[PDB]
Ligand binder design. Structure first.
Ligand SMILES: CCCCCC/C=C/CCCCCCCC(=O)O
Length: 276
């Protein structure tokens, strides 16, 4: 018995036929890419006001520290499956310093797109399916994966004239890291502005661009924290609520249902395959 994957995490959700997932102000804690196994689905981004049709050759990229508002509805007469690959921070910082040379046009890209669509060529279909096939690959050295992912993200960015992988100087990254370092603390806007030794304009623009008040942002971060806790194997709802910084199981359940459109136990089952 050896270790689990330190660069990625792979998560699992069963989309029953014609069902609709609705995400309202969900905080993306790490760079994510997801795709469906078969059939097709209607993906409605309520941020950029755009509806797409995604197939098994599509991948959706979700930018770290974004606040997503979108829906996913199966269009096929089949029970389809959504696989979510999360790329952890160490791997992302490896990617940031991997591409040889200066990309002269990247200095002119914009950061305004948080949800990017890429219709895969056969090579990328292969590589991604092999990454998520098992819990190890080992046929795939992490250096091969660094090269692959740096190239893939560059391709997507060029497709959209936008920055996917930001630097770590980003103000939203600082806010998120600070909140997550003490998730149970009763943070207030002034505390974060003071500890981040940054004025309230620089920081409040991060809230306005994502369309969230401060309390909404704290709640979204805590919901994503609770989901990460459920990833780690913690399954007691009371512990999940308290460790994520919520005052009560009832308030945590209310916020979780408002954000993910399912109760914490329902998400638990969709992730676990194990009902009570
Ligand atoms: C929170 C990101 C959801 C984007 C994935 C598309 C839909 C997936 C099915 C519902 C899963 C919601 C929790 C996903 C969290 C994760 O696996 O990283």
């Amino acid at each position: 018995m050896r270790e689990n994957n330190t660069s990625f995490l792979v998560n699992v959700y069963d989309l029953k036929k014609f069902d609709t997932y609705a995400f309202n102000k969900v905080f993306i804690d790490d760079y994510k890419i997801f795709w469906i196994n078969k059939g097709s689905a209607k993906l409605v981004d309520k941020n950029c006001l755009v509806s797409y049709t995604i197939t098994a050759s599509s991948v959706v990229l979700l930018k770290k520290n974004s606040i997503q508002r979108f829906s996913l509805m199966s269009l096929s007469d089949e029970s389809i499956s959504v696989c979510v690959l999360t790329i952890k921070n160490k791997f992302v910082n490896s990617l940031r310093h991997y591409l040889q040379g200066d990309l002269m046009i990247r200095n002119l890209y914009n950061e305004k797109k948080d949800l990017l669509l890429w219709n895969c060529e056969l090579n990328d279909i292969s590589v991604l399916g092999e990454i998520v096939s098992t819990y190890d690959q080992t046929q795939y050295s992490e250096d091969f994966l660094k090269i692959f992912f740096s190239g893939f993200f560059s391709k997507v960015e060029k497709k959209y004239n936008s920055i996917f992988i930001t630097d770590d100087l980003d103000a939203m990254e600082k806010i998120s890291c600070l909140v997550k370092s003490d998730i149970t603390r009763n943070w207030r806007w002034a505390d974060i502005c003071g500890e981040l030794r940054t004025n309230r304009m620089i920081l409040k623009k991060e809230l306005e661009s994502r369309g969230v008040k401060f309390r909404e942002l704290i709640n979204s971060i805590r919901i994503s924290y609770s989901i990460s806790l459920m990833a780690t194997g913690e399954f007691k709802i009371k512990q999940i609520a308290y460790q994520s910084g919520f005052a009560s199981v009832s308030y945590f359940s209310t916020v979780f249902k408002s954000t993910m459109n399912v109760a914490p136990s329902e998400y638990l089952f969709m992730l676990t395959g194990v009902a009570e």
